[PDB]
Amino acid sequence: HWGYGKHNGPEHWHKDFPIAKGERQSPVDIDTHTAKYDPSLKPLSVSYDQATSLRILNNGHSFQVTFDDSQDKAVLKGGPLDGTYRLLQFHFHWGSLDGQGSEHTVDKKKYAAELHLVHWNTKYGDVGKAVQQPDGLAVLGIFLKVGSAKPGLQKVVDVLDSIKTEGKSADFTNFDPRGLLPESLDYWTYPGSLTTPPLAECVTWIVLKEPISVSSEQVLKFRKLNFNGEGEPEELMVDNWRPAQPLKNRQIKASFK
Ligand SMILES: CCC(=O)Nc1nnc(S(N)(=O)=O)s1
Ligand SMILES: [Zn+2]
């Protein structure tokens, strides 16, 4: 089964998921000087006030906080999007050291981690149908740098000891994802894909320019998670990022000058 190791990592994924070599794969390097400012792009609308988190789960490749997406409770709209996208889950990608971990890069710079808030287009009714559509999902990507702590992240990091190994989950209610957002909603956007199998080419990517800062203690907690299930040889869940993929025939647009 796929993973991030030498024998099952991103360089191997194309054998089970041939779309890995497709025309709109993610992540990509964001070349800030080539991205074109698009004045037609609208401000992002992030409506998270009624978000209902449900569970936190170690799925063997990341940890994920899942939300009630049976109603228009926490929705993404505007920006480059047509229509309404419901928040399903957020998760992170991070490194073994602070100089790597993000999936997208900015002028080849890697951040310590990257937060993905995953939303799906309500016109397709459920996320399984949305992943089969070129505009089915919108993922909001936020870079993490190491410095000052992010207070809104602490409730997440403090329960990670309870989901150390693959398959473990816990109740995780009343978590407010607004505490993970930076000040600015300036963004880059391009058409791309899921960055884990099945690598489906269904994602409008919205990557925020402004990182959030997290503390070393916070990201050290990420690095204590396990890829393995309980009872298997301990393999730290670190470096769970796919590297930048060829941009091919795509334009990255910027919402800001
Ligand atoms: C449909 C469930 C789901 O969200 N799958 C994802 N697969 N890759 C994602 S990423 N790393 O691009 O945000 S999300
Ligand atoms: Zn992700």
Side-chain angles (χ1 to χ4, degrees):
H1 179 85
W2 67 271
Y4 294 93
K6 166 167 201 57
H7 301 280
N8 66 351
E11 297 313 309
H12 292 268
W13 291 353
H14 72 102
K15 294 176 278 176
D16 289 290
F17 310 93
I19 202 57
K21 299 182 177 291
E23 296 306 300
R24 53 172 284 181
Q25 287 290 288
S26 292
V28 296
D29 179 57
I30 299 164
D31 193 79
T32 62
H33 286 295
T34 310
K36 195 184 167 58
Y37 170 55
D38 186 349
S40 67
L41 283 172
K42 309 162 199 64
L44 254 194
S45 171
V46 183
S47 301
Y48 285 174
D49 48 296
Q50 293 302 305
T52 297
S53 63
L54 298 169
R55 317 271 305 162
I56 191 168
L57 157 73
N58 178 336
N59 55 31
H61 47 275
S62 187
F63 73 88
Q64 181 192 132
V65 173
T66 305
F67 290 79
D68 171 21
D69 64 344
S70 69
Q71 256 188 299
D72 287 3
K73 282 176 158 184
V75 296
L76 185 61
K77 85 218 315 171
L81 309 169
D82 286 327
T84 302
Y85 289 69
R86 283 182 192 163
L87 176 65
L88 169 65
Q89 55 106 328
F90 71 76
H91 62 273
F92 299 79
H93 307 266
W94 61 91
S96 47
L97 287 181
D98 296 349
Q100 67 203 61
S102 69
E103 301 205 302
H104 294 89
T105 53
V106 183
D107 296 332
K108 296 305 170 90
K109 169 188 183 67
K110 301 166 162 78
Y111 286 90
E114 190 172 327
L115 161 68
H116 289 162
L117 295 121
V118 182
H119 315 71
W120 54 272
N121 193 333
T122 63
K123 83 198 223 72
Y124 301 124
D126 68 69
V127 66
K129 283 295 183 125
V131 292
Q132 318 180 41
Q133 316 297 332
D135 58 351
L137 270 65
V139 186
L140 181 56
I142 300 170
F143 295 117
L144 277 61
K145 62 177 155 71
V146 177
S148 301
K150 192 65 172 165
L153 179 61
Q154 194 57 35
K155 286 188 192 182
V156 167
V157 297
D158 276 337
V159 305
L160 295 181
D161 77 290
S162 76
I163 56 157
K164 179 177 183 185
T165 45
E166 163 173 15
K168 294 198 100 195
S169 63
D171 290 308
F172 199 68
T173 55
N174 300 105
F175 180 78
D176 191 341
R178 293 177 297 185
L180 302 172
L181 306 175
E183 282 182 10
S184 178
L185 291 183
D186 291 349
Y187 61 87
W188 296 287
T189 184
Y190 75 97
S193 75
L194 309 180
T195 70
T196 53
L199 307 168
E201 287 180 336
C202 60
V203 181
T204 301
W205 274 97
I206 301 164
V207 178
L208 297 188
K209 171 178 43 87
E210 181 182 327
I212 58 164
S213 176
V214 301
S215 67
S216 56
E217 292 87 4
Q218 289 181 318
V219 72
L220 278 170
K221 307 242 237 260
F222 286 14
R223 301 186 181 138
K224 290 187 40 166
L225 293 164
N226 281 6
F227 283 130
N228 53 281
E230 198 176 353
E232 291 159 22
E234 174 165 21
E235 306 296 337
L236 288 194
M237 182 182 283
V238 291
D239 292 316
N240 59 345
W241 48 278
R242 185 189 200 193
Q245 299 306 300
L247 189 59
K248 296 189 167 173
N249 183 49
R250 289 178 290 178
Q251 170 73 40
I252 303 184
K253 303 194 250 241
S255 77
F256 56 95
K257 213 166 219 173

mmCIF file with all atom_site columns, all heavy atoms in Angstrom, residues 1-2 8 11 44 57 61 113 130 149 162 167 169 193 225 230 249 251 253:
data_model
loop_
_atom_site.group_PDB
_atom_site.id
_atom_site.type_symbol
_atom_site.label_atom_id
_atom_site.label_alt_id
_atom_site.label_comp_id
_atom_site.label_asym_id
_atom_site.label_entity_id
_atom_site.label_seq_id
_atom_site.pdbx_PDB_ins_code
_atom_site.Cartn_x
_atom_site.Cartn_y
_atom_site.Cartn_z
_atom_site.occupancy
_atom_site.B_iso_or_equiv
_atom_site.pdbx_formal_charge
_atom_site.auth_seq_id
_atom_site.auth_comp_id
_atom_site.auth_asym_id
_atom_site.auth_atom_id
_atom_site.pdbx_PDB_model_num
ATOM 1   N N   . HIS A 1 1   ? 0.837   -1.194 0.000   1.00 0.00 ? 1   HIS A N   1
ATOM 2   C CA  . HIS A 1 1   ? 0.000   0.000  0.000   1.00 0.00 ? 1   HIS A CA  1
ATOM 3   C C   . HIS A 1 1   ? 0.875   1.249  0.000   1.00 0.00 ? 1   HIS A C   1
ATOM 4   O O   . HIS A 1 1   ? 2.034   1.208  0.414   1.00 0.00 ? 1   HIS A O   1
ATOM 5   C CB  . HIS A 1 1   ? -0.924  -0.026 1.227   1.00 0.00 ? 1   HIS A CB  1
ATOM 6   C CG  . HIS A 1 1   ? -1.822  1.166  1.362   1.00 0.00 ? 1   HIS A CG  1
ATOM 7   N ND1 . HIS A 1 1   ? -3.036  1.262  0.715   1.00 0.00 ? 1   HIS A ND1 1
ATOM 8   C CD2 . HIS A 1 1   ? -1.701  2.294  2.103   1.00 0.00 ? 1   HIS A CD2 1
ATOM 9   C CE1 . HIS A 1 1   ? -3.615  2.406  1.035   1.00 0.00 ? 1   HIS A CE1 1
ATOM 10  N NE2 . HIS A 1 1   ? -2.825  3.051  1.877   1.00 0.00 ? 1   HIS A NE2 1
ATOM 11  N N   . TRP A 1 2   ? 0.331   2.349  -0.506  1.00 0.00 ? 2   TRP A N   1
ATOM 12  C CA  . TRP A 1 2   ? 1.133   3.534  -0.751  1.00 0.00 ? 2   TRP A CA  1
ATOM 13  C C   . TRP A 1 2   ? 1.482   4.238  0.551   1.00 0.00 ? 2   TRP A C   1
ATOM 14  O O   . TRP A 1 2   ? 0.804   4.100  1.571   1.00 0.00 ? 2   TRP A O   1
ATOM 15  C CB  . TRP A 1 2   ? 0.396   4.510  -1.667  1.00 0.00 ? 2   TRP A CB  1
ATOM 16  C CG  . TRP A 1 2   ? -0.828  5.110  -1.044  1.00 0.00 ? 2   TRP A CG  1
ATOM 17  C CD1 . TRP A 1 2   ? -2.101  4.604  -1.077  1.00 0.00 ? 2   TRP A CD1 1
ATOM 18  C CD2 . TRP A 1 2   ? -0.907  6.344  -0.308  1.00 0.00 ? 2   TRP A CD2 1
ATOM 19  N NE1 . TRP A 1 2   ? -2.961  5.441  -0.403  1.00 0.00 ? 2   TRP A NE1 1
ATOM 20  C CE2 . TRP A 1 2   ? -2.253  6.514  0.077   1.00 0.00 ? 2   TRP A CE2 1
ATOM 21  C CE3 . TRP A 1 2   ? 0.030   7.320  0.056   1.00 0.00 ? 2   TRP A CE3 1
ATOM 22  C CZ2 . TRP A 1 2   ? -2.686  7.614  0.808   1.00 0.00 ? 2   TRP A CZ2 1
ATOM 23  C CZ3 . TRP A 1 2   ? -0.404  8.414  0.796   1.00 0.00 ? 2   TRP A CZ3 1
ATOM 24  C CH2 . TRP A 1 2   ? -1.756  8.552  1.153   1.00 0.00 ? 2   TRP A CH2 1
ATOM 25  N N   . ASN A 1 8   ? 7.504   2.850  -1.270  1.00 0.00 ? 8   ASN A N   1
ATOM 26  C CA  . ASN A 1 8   ? 6.097   3.066  -1.578  1.00 0.00 ? 8   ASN A CA  1
ATOM 27  C C   . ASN A 1 8   ? 5.751   4.550  -1.650  1.00 0.00 ? 8   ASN A C   1
ATOM 28  O O   . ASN A 1 8   ? 4.566   4.902  -1.639  1.00 0.00 ? 8   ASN A O   1
ATOM 29  C CB  . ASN A 1 8   ? 5.206   2.366  -0.554  1.00 0.00 ? 8   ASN A CB  1
ATOM 30  C CG  . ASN A 1 8   ? 5.333   2.953  0.841   1.00 0.00 ? 8   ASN A CG  1
ATOM 31  O OD1 . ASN A 1 8   ? 6.203   3.788  1.109   1.00 0.00 ? 8   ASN A OD1 1
ATOM 32  N ND2 . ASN A 1 8   ? 4.459   2.515  1.741   1.00 0.00 ? 8   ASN A ND2 1
ATOM 33  N N   . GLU A 1 11  ? 7.316   8.651  -5.692  1.00 0.00 ? 11  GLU A N   1
ATOM 34  C CA  . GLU A 1 11  ? 7.888   8.195  -6.955  1.00 0.00 ? 11  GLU A CA  1
ATOM 35  C C   . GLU A 1 11  ? 7.284   6.881  -7.429  1.00 0.00 ? 11  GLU A C   1
ATOM 36  O O   . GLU A 1 11  ? 7.483   6.512  -8.593  1.00 0.00 ? 11  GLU A O   1
ATOM 37  C CB  . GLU A 1 11  ? 9.407   8.029  -6.831  1.00 0.00 ? 11  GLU A CB  1
ATOM 38  C CG  . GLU A 1 11  ? 9.989   9.323  -6.544  1.00 0.00 ? 11  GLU A CG  1
ATOM 39  C CD  . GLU A 1 11  ? 9.519   10.469 -7.410  1.00 0.00 ? 11  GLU A CD  1
ATOM 40  O OE1 . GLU A 1 11  ? 9.555   10.327 -8.639  1.00 0.00 ? 11  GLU A OE1 1
ATOM 41  O OE2 . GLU A 1 11  ? 9.111   11.509 -6.858  1.00 0.00 ? 11  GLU A OE2 1
ATOM 42  N N   . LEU A 1 44  ? -11.831 35.983 -1.294  1.00 0.00 ? 44  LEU A N   1
ATOM 43  C CA  . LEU A 1 44  ? -12.300 34.721 -0.752  1.00 0.00 ? 44  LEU A CA  1
ATOM 44  C C   . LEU A 1 44  ? -13.354 34.991 0.310   1.00 0.00 ? 44  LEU A C   1
ATOM 45  O O   . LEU A 1 44  ? -13.228 35.930 1.098   1.00 0.00 ? 44  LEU A O   1
ATOM 46  C CB  . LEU A 1 44  ? -11.141 33.952 -0.133  1.00 0.00 ? 44  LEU A CB  1
ATOM 47  C CG  . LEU A 1 44  ? -10.528 32.731 -0.787  1.00 0.00 ? 44  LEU A CG  1
ATOM 48  C CD1 . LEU A 1 44  ? -9.670  32.045 0.258   1.00 0.00 ? 44  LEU A CD1 1
ATOM 49  C CD2 . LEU A 1 44  ? -11.607 31.801 -1.325  1.00 0.00 ? 44  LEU A CD2 1
ATOM 50  N N   . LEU A 1 57  ? -8.653  12.011 13.668  1.00 0.00 ? 57  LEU A N   1
ATOM 51  C CA  . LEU A 1 57  ? -8.332  10.653 13.251  1.00 0.00 ? 57  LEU A CA  1
ATOM 52  C C   . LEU A 1 57  ? -6.918  10.602 12.693  1.00 0.00 ? 57  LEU A C   1
ATOM 53  O O   . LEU A 1 57  ? -6.509  11.507 11.967  1.00 0.00 ? 57  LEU A O   1
ATOM 54  C CB  . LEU A 1 57  ? -9.336  10.165 12.191  1.00 0.00 ? 57  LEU A CB  1
ATOM 55  C CG  . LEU A 1 57  ? -8.993  9.040  11.209  1.00 0.00 ? 57  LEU A CG  1
ATOM 56  C CD1 . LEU A 1 57  ? -8.972  7.685  11.907  1.00 0.00 ? 57  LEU A CD1 1
ATOM 57  C CD2 . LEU A 1 57  ? -9.984  9.026  10.051  1.00 0.00 ? 57  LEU A CD2 1
ATOM 58  N N   . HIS A 1 61  ? -1.596  8.326  6.948   1.00 0.00 ? 61  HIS A N   1
ATOM 59  C CA  . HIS A 1 61  ? -0.799  9.278  6.186   1.00 0.00 ? 61  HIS A CA  1
ATOM 60  C C   . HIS A 1 61  ? -0.822  10.696 6.734   1.00 0.00 ? 61  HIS A C   1
ATOM 61  O O   . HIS A 1 61  ? 0.082   11.470 6.414   1.00 0.00 ? 61  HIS A O   1
ATOM 62  C CB  . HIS A 1 61  ? -1.225  9.316  4.705   1.00 0.00 ? 61  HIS A CB  1
ATOM 63  C CG  . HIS A 1 61  ? -2.704  9.403  4.467   1.00 0.00 ? 61  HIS A CG  1
ATOM 64  N ND1 . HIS A 1 61  ? -3.524  8.293  4.436   1.00 0.00 ? 61  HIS A ND1 1
ATOM 65  C CD2 . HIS A 1 61  ? -3.499  10.464 4.183   1.00 0.00 ? 61  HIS A CD2 1
ATOM 66  C CE1 . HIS A 1 61  ? -4.763  8.671  4.172   1.00 0.00 ? 61  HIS A CE1 1
ATOM 67  N NE2 . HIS A 1 61  ? -4.775  9.983  4.011   1.00 0.00 ? 61  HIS A NE2 1
ATOM 68  N N   . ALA A 1 113 ? 5.420   23.081 7.311   1.00 0.00 ? 113 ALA A N   1
ATOM 69  C CA  . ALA A 1 113 ? 4.201   22.292 7.221   1.00 0.00 ? 113 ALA A CA  1
ATOM 70  C C   . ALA A 1 113 ? 3.211   23.038 6.348   1.00 0.00 ? 113 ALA A C   1
ATOM 71  O O   . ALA A 1 113 ? 3.412   24.202 5.986   1.00 0.00 ? 113 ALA A O   1
ATOM 72  C CB  . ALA A 1 113 ? 3.595   22.003 8.615   1.00 0.00 ? 113 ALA A CB  1
ATOM 73  N N   . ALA A 1 130 ? -18.102 14.513 -6.075  1.00 0.00 ? 130 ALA A N   1
ATOM 74  C CA  . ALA A 1 130 ? -17.310 15.710 -6.345  1.00 0.00 ? 130 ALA A CA  1
ATOM 75  C C   . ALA A 1 130 ? -15.893 15.367 -6.790  1.00 0.00 ? 130 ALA A C   1
ATOM 76  O O   . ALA A 1 130 ? -15.324 16.060 -7.647  1.00 0.00 ? 130 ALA A O   1
ATOM 77  C CB  . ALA A 1 130 ? -17.274 16.596 -5.094  1.00 0.00 ? 130 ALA A CB  1
ATOM 78  N N   . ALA A 1 149 ? 3.975   30.548 18.778  1.00 0.00 ? 149 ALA A N   1
ATOM 79  C CA  . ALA A 1 149 ? 2.923   29.543 18.774  1.00 0.00 ? 149 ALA A CA  1
ATOM 80  C C   . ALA A 1 149 ? 1.640   30.105 18.172  1.00 0.00 ? 149 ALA A C   1
ATOM 81  O O   . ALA A 1 149 ? 1.380   31.312 18.211  1.00 0.00 ? 149 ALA A O   1
ATOM 82  C CB  . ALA A 1 149 ? 2.649   29.042 20.196  1.00 0.00 ? 149 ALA A CB  1
ATOM 83  N N   . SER A 1 162 ? -3.466  10.886 21.852  1.00 0.00 ? 162 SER A N   1
ATOM 84  C CA  . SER A 1 162 ? -4.543  9.907  21.914  1.00 0.00 ? 162 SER A CA  1
ATOM 85  C C   . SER A 1 162 ? -4.831  9.256  20.566  1.00 0.00 ? 162 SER A C   1
ATOM 86  O O   . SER A 1 162 ? -5.673  8.347  20.499  1.00 0.00 ? 162 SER A O   1
ATOM 87  C CB  . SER A 1 162 ? -5.819  10.563 22.457  1.00 0.00 ? 162 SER A CB  1
ATOM 88  O OG  . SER A 1 162 ? -6.442  11.370 21.474  1.00 0.00 ? 162 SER A OG  1
ATOM 89  N N   . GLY A 1 167 ? -5.382  4.378  12.464  1.00 0.00 ? 167 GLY A N   1
ATOM 90  C CA  . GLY A 1 167 ? -6.661  3.821  12.833  1.00 0.00 ? 167 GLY A CA  1
ATOM 91  C C   . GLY A 1 167 ? -7.273  4.398  14.096  1.00 0.00 ? 167 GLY A C   1
ATOM 92  O O   . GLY A 1 167 ? -8.474  4.218  14.322  1.00 0.00 ? 167 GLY A O   1
ATOM 93  N N   . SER A 1 169 ? -8.876  7.180  16.564  1.00 0.00 ? 169 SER A N   1
ATOM 94  C CA  . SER A 1 169 ? -9.655  8.402  16.432  1.00 0.00 ? 169 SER A CA  1
ATOM 95  C C   . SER A 1 169 ? -10.217 8.800  17.794  1.00 0.00 ? 169 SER A C   1
ATOM 96  O O   . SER A 1 169 ? -10.209 8.022  18.754  1.00 0.00 ? 169 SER A O   1
ATOM 97  C CB  . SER A 1 169 ? -10.780 8.245  15.406  1.00 0.00 ? 169 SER A CB  1
ATOM 98  O OG  . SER A 1 169 ? -11.709 7.254  15.807  1.00 0.00 ? 169 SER A OG  1
ATOM 99  N N   . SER A 1 193 ? -4.920  18.864 -8.232  1.00 0.00 ? 193 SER A N   1
ATOM 100 C CA  . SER A 1 193 ? -5.322  17.503 -7.904  1.00 0.00 ? 193 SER A CA  1
ATOM 101 C C   . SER A 1 193 ? -5.248  17.289 -6.404  1.00 0.00 ? 193 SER A C   1
ATOM 102 O O   . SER A 1 193 ? -4.690  18.100 -5.664  1.00 0.00 ? 193 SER A O   1
ATOM 103 C CB  . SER A 1 193 ? -4.415  16.476 -8.593  1.00 0.00 ? 193 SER A CB  1
ATOM 104 O OG  . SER A 1 193 ? -3.148  16.425 -7.932  1.00 0.00 ? 193 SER A OG  1
ATOM 105 N N   . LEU A 1 225 ? 3.611   11.488 15.991  1.00 0.00 ? 225 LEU A N   1
ATOM 106 C CA  . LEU A 1 225 ? 2.632   10.559 15.455  1.00 0.00 ? 225 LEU A CA  1
ATOM 107 C C   . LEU A 1 225 ? 3.334   9.429  14.708  1.00 0.00 ? 225 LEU A C   1
ATOM 108 O O   . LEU A 1 225 ? 4.525   9.498  14.400  1.00 0.00 ? 225 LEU A O   1
ATOM 109 C CB  . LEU A 1 225 ? 1.663   11.277 14.516  1.00 0.00 ? 225 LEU A CB  1
ATOM 110 C CG  . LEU A 1 225 ? 0.747   12.281 15.197  1.00 0.00 ? 225 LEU A CG  1
ATOM 111 C CD1 . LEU A 1 225 ? 0.137   13.203 14.159  1.00 0.00 ? 225 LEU A CD1 1
ATOM 112 C CD2 . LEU A 1 225 ? -0.330  11.536 15.965  1.00 0.00 ? 225 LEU A CD2 1
ATOM 113 N N   . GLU A 1 230 ? -0.750  0.352  15.836  1.00 0.00 ? 230 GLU A N   1
ATOM 114 C CA  . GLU A 1 230 ? -0.272  -0.152 17.116  1.00 0.00 ? 230 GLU A CA  1
ATOM 115 C C   . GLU A 1 230 ? 0.178   -1.603 16.975  1.00 0.00 ? 230 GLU A C   1
ATOM 116 O O   . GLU A 1 230 ? -0.465  -2.408 16.295  1.00 0.00 ? 230 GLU A O   1
ATOM 117 C CB  . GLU A 1 230 ? -1.375  -0.035 18.169  1.00 0.00 ? 230 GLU A CB  1
ATOM 118 C CG  . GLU A 1 230 ? -0.879  -0.109 19.600  1.00 0.00 ? 230 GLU A CG  1
ATOM 119 C CD  . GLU A 1 230 ? -1.988  0.118  20.601  1.00 0.00 ? 230 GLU A CD  1
ATOM 120 O OE1 . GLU A 1 230 ? -3.111  0.460  20.180  1.00 0.00 ? 230 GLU A OE1 1
ATOM 121 O OE2 . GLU A 1 230 ? -1.735  -0.045 21.812  1.00 0.00 ? 230 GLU A OE2 1
ATOM 122 N N   . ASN A 1 249 ? 0.619   22.763 -18.630 1.00 0.00 ? 249 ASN A N   1
ATOM 123 C CA  . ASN A 1 249 ? -0.098  23.843 -19.305 1.00 0.00 ? 249 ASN A CA  1
ATOM 124 C C   . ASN A 1 249 ? -1.056  24.534 -18.336 1.00 0.00 ? 249 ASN A C   1
ATOM 125 O O   . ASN A 1 249 ? -2.278  24.520 -18.503 1.00 0.00 ? 249 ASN A O   1
ATOM 126 C CB  . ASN A 1 249 ? -0.829  23.305 -20.531 1.00 0.00 ? 249 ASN A CB  1
ATOM 127 C CG  . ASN A 1 249 ? -1.532  24.398 -21.319 1.00 0.00 ? 249 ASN A CG  1
ATOM 128 O OD1 . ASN A 1 249 ? -0.938  25.435 -21.627 1.00 0.00 ? 249 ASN A OD1 1
ATOM 129 N ND2 . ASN A 1 249 ? -2.796  24.169 -21.653 1.00 0.00 ? 249 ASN A ND2 1
ATOM 130 N N   . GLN A 1 251 ? -1.607  28.072 -15.557 1.00 0.00 ? 251 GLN A N   1
ATOM 131 C CA  . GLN A 1 251 ? -1.280  29.412 -15.110 1.00 0.00 ? 251 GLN A CA  1
ATOM 132 C C   . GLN A 1 251 ? -1.710  29.549 -13.659 1.00 0.00 ? 251 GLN A C   1
ATOM 133 O O   . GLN A 1 251 ? -2.850  29.218 -13.314 1.00 0.00 ? 251 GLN A O   1
ATOM 134 C CB  . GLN A 1 251 ? -1.997  30.451 -15.975 1.00 0.00 ? 251 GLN A CB  1
ATOM 135 C CG  . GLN A 1 251 ? -1.918  31.872 -15.470 1.00 0.00 ? 251 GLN A CG  1
ATOM 136 C CD  . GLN A 1 251 ? -0.541  32.487 -15.654 1.00 0.00 ? 251 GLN A CD  1
ATOM 137 O OE1 . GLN A 1 251 ? 0.116   32.277 -16.673 1.00 0.00 ? 251 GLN A OE1 1
ATOM 138 N NE2 . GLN A 1 251 ? -0.096  33.241 -14.665 1.00 0.00 ? 251 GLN A NE2 1
ATOM 139 N N   . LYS A 1 253 ? -2.683  32.111 -10.859 1.00 0.00 ? 253 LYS A N   1
ATOM 140 C CA  . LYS A 1 253 ? -3.171  33.476 -10.768 1.00 0.00 ? 253 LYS A CA  1
ATOM 141 C C   . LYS A 1 253 ? -3.029  33.963 -9.331  1.00 0.00 ? 253 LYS A C   1
ATOM 142 O O   . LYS A 1 253 ? -3.139  33.183 -8.384  1.00 0.00 ? 253 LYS A O   1
ATOM 143 C CB  . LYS A 1 253 ? -4.634  33.552 -11.222 1.00 0.00 ? 253 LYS A CB  1
ATOM 144 C CG  . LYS A 1 253 ? -4.873  33.032 -12.651 1.00 0.00 ? 253 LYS A CG  1
ATOM 145 C CD  . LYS A 1 253 ? -6.242  33.453 -13.153 1.00 0.00 ? 253 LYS A CD  1
ATOM 146 C CE  . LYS A 1 253 ? -7.208  32.279 -13.263 1.00 0.00 ? 253 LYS A CE  1
ATOM 147 N NZ  . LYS A 1 253 ? -7.670  32.074 -14.670 1.00 0.00 ? 253 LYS A NZ  1
#
